[PDB]
């Protein structure tokens, strides 16, 4: 009763979403047919006709089968699950497998041992990719309990910010301060936490100690822009233009244009905006602002329409997960 | 025990007081002490009898006779007894408990009630008798050191640090420096003004030594007054040279491995008669005799079922 | 006020500034409120200064004149502020009541009060109904007649808000209170005469349900045996015994009473006869027969008591079983805006909770069709809980007003409390909640972990733990904590939660509610927060506190097993929060709540003073002590130091973050934790 | 229409998310019951879910 099971496990020849969906359907139907409990097995015919019937009963059938398996087919199934999660990851199958893993965690059987440590890192990665941030936070907290690392703290802060929990991120930062000192604390932590003054201090001290670098200078510029000290930002921009590579030039261009607009230097504003790429929402926005300043109303309306077209994707992506 | 010039009494939560032998390390005999544990063991200067401080009762056991019953059981006290002192005359016994009322006991007198009472605000954690036999040092949970004069009752209240429970305080036999220690782990040292009749006894804060990071339990000076041993919850006994206040020798009982939590506290300190050796009690149920210069366990004492909390040591001839 | 402070020079200048502010803007609520508050504070300052100077003839008259001059403007301003605010006038209303009860006996002040009452709207006094009823029997007849008239008006409009407290007051042991309560009730009857009777019968039958005759005999025999055998107080023993026999003299009224009589009453009468023979003779052989009968019936009823698992209406009280579709509204449910939910029916069965006090589980049916479960508390006062609930309502309103607190959705879970007597009363039952102790026990049993593992480890390491000194207790406590994994609460929270999405929301709500309740309890001085005394919601996750018996640092003051912990923040709760610890949601929420309350220190201070200066609740202070006025003043001053932040150091004012940090360090300190009673579960 | 939707959203203004908020068991079955009882419970729950509505007219 494990031949078609193994065939479904070691297939690994799906190159499209529908192939993995059909694989999941076949796996669920085979689990229902092979289910030891007669009540679950009786639902196999209905699950063939109705997919949600198989989907809802997936966890119970998996639990029954995994209880049946004698620790070898368990290993084969675990390897197949790891292969499905890591390779050709698909959001629906990913969420189904995550729900299965959570269901196993709640059960007295115990979490499914995946590539050691019950696959905490892999489950967190999949949860983050599928935007199931609660599971990602739970798994990251478990990984932290196993052992605390600055990377774990960074991931925890990112998750909390993505979960609209600034207080949690502040607590993580406080724990980092108390335990890891100061060197392990990158200014990016404050930047994500919006502790702009602390981030500015950290950037200033790092630029004082370490030789001037594009990343630290860009971070300090971002902190200045968030704070709003347009004078210092424009001074930094003017001081470092020729000493700036083209990629760093384009990255500066947006903040430089913002500083010039704040200060009213429209000549510098035009110079910086011309450097901003056209395929950026900010680039279209600042070009429209310049058109308004120069009273190019038709070009301004066209640029605003282009900015809306660009913002379409961003709004669609963000609105998918909550308001 | 009593016949042996070296007396080392050890007791803890196991209700027994065991007298080991320094030369061998063998429990000579045990004495039953029921109804409570013991909080302090002290040998009288006369060496006639030892004194055990427990909970609500003060017991004194004979040192010469073997397997005796408690000779004197001073009752009428509550809230434990933190520590016990003894006048060099052997006439007066000084005690302090958590009832915030130090008491003075006349051993010669048959009266059960105490003689002199010094009451303070916070529970008393330690009492130390100055070598001049005229002033009494009293600690408290609020950290206010009280210098109770035995003749004028003029108590001077000094608080080295606000809202830290002071645990122990001791003065060298030469009355040069006085060390006080609190739950913070800091070692506060006071220079003693050379005033006996004047009773000035002014305390000059010399150095606040960050002796320990965790709770610090007990401090005591060497008879030579050149060494200062400091116990703590860090399981480390630190020895400070009096001239420099630097860690000459650190006596630790750590497992030397991260995979070990709560090995056991260390609250035992007793210099040898010539300060060459040092006796240390600890919660590990194993008292240890260390070498001061090298820092090695010359002898180890074992057999206590529960944690060792007190000690006794006397090399008087 | 901030710079100069309060003194003789400051008051006229601040008064003229606020008077000018009122003159330039009549309609502004803030100006009138500040003016009234300033006048009230001036009155208090003058009273305190004169008390400190004269006590420690002509000076008394001058003080009276000055106080009368400052009082009337305060009353007028408070009334105008109440009229303007229209919804958040609780502080002003309580200040009005304080001024009324303190200086209303003066004819000018009384005239100002009656003018304000005529001007003010009736609906406002619904908030301060209990405070009004606390002063029904004021010795000053001038104040009393106005109070009675106002209560007659309150009965006229929205009678439902006055029936229960009037019914409770009517059965008061003291003659004056019950007399005035009946004097109000007769006037109220001419309006309805039906609500009053329904409330009377409901109260009597509910009191009968809460305490049964056999239980009363059990407790009376316990007290009598204690007196006789420990204290040899035979006269006090007889004094304790006599009211039970007096209640027996009424005779059986229900089936349960008839059965109890047929069982024990003959033996009780024989023992009473023996007691009378002893009283007339004074023979030990006469009293020993009565004592033998008492012990025999006591053993019988002690054996019977566990069998009393459930109570049915037909035996205990068929009167309630008769009740159908009463106009009487569900207790603690009437609202001036919402439709009245009158009782539809009472469930025939009451599931008595097997506890030390044995509380019943009454469940009513409303006119709207929704069940309302209640707990029938016996032999415990509920007026303190009523004032605590009023304070919690004020705190909820303040948190709602604040933008940040409302943004974080901070609130205190509260349940309706309805006192019925000095001993019995009614408590609203909150659904989907259970004690922390029960959850811990269930999790440890499920995981096959010994329930008392930590205490057992402590005893194994040290059998004399209770008699150990402070440092020894600290060592034992640390050893126990280190050798135990204290993640039970977080683990059971994760297991109980269906999905991580719900789990995180429950944890966030738990953290925020715990922080809010901790800060509020510290300000209130609420003590004795043992795990059975606080309940965790299984759906929302909000922490709920009950059993507000000990308040205002009673736990610290009592000599036996004193508590050094302002609020329960044991390591179990700490692990239950985020893995980072207290530095996250908890500390920031505490900062927000303390900032909000310190901002509104006046309102909370007034609410607290209302029921601290209340004579009906000063018995607890006297029991705490080892006069009354100095104790109440000291308590209010301690609360003021808590709110301002000068509690830790009187000389040095403390900001909100530092005060919260010190509170956390003190509550989580092992040295302060180990002093707690073992049953408080510090290790948990 | 995407441009019009974005434009009207902008015109209406970026509403405060709290203002938006104010404007507006199977795993439990596993946690409660053992597997032998859990299987019929979840099976019955799913069969009842299918039983309602017009999907019944097919199944």
Residue numbers in the entry:
A (entry chain A): 1261 to 1583
B (entry chain C): 8 to 324
C (entry chain A): 1759 to 1814, 1867 to 2436, 2492 to 2549
D (entry chain A): 880 to 903, 933 to 967
Paper text:
pmcMechanistic target of rapamycin (mTOR, also known as mammalian TOR) is an essential serine/threonine protein kinase that responds to nutrients, growth factors, and cellular energy to promote cell growth. mTOR nucleates two distinct complexes, mTORC1 and mTORC2, each characterized by specific subunits, targets, downstream signaling pathways, and functions. mTORC1 contains mTOR, regulatory-associated protein of mTOR (RAPTOR), and mammalian lethal with SEC13 protein 8 (mLST8). RAPTOR binds mTORC1 substrates, including the well-characterized substrates ribosomal protein S6 kinase 1 (S6K1) and 4E binding protein 1 (4E-BP1), through a five-amino acid motif termed TOS. RAPTOR binds the LST2 TOS sequence to present LST2 to the kinase catalytic site in mTOR for phosphorylation of LST2 S670. mTORC1-dependent phosphorylation at S670 leads to monoubiquitination and stabilization of LST2.
To investigate the possibility that mTORC1 binds multiple sequences in LST2, we solved the structure of mTORC1 with bound, full-length LST2. To characterize the binding of LST2 to mTORC1, we performed cryo-EM single-particle analysis on mTORC1 in complex with full-length LST2. An overall refinement of mTORC1 in complex with LST2 was obtained at 4.02 Å resolution. Interestingly, density representing LST2 was observed only in the RAPTOR TOS-binding pocket, suggesting that mTORC1 recognizes LST2 solely through the TOS sequence. Our cryo-EM data suggest that mTORC1 recognizes LST2 exclusively through the TOS sequence and that RAPTOR binds the LST2 and 4E-BP1 TOS sequences in a highly similar manner. To determine whether LST2 is an mTORC1 substrate, as suggested by the LST2 TOS sequence, we performed an in vitro kinase assay with purified mTORC1 and full-length LST2. mTORC1 efficiently phosphorylated wild-type LST2, but not LST2-F401A, in vitro, indicating that mTORC1 phosphorylates LST2 in a TOS-dependent manner. Thus, LST2 is phosphorylated by mTORC1, primarily at S670.
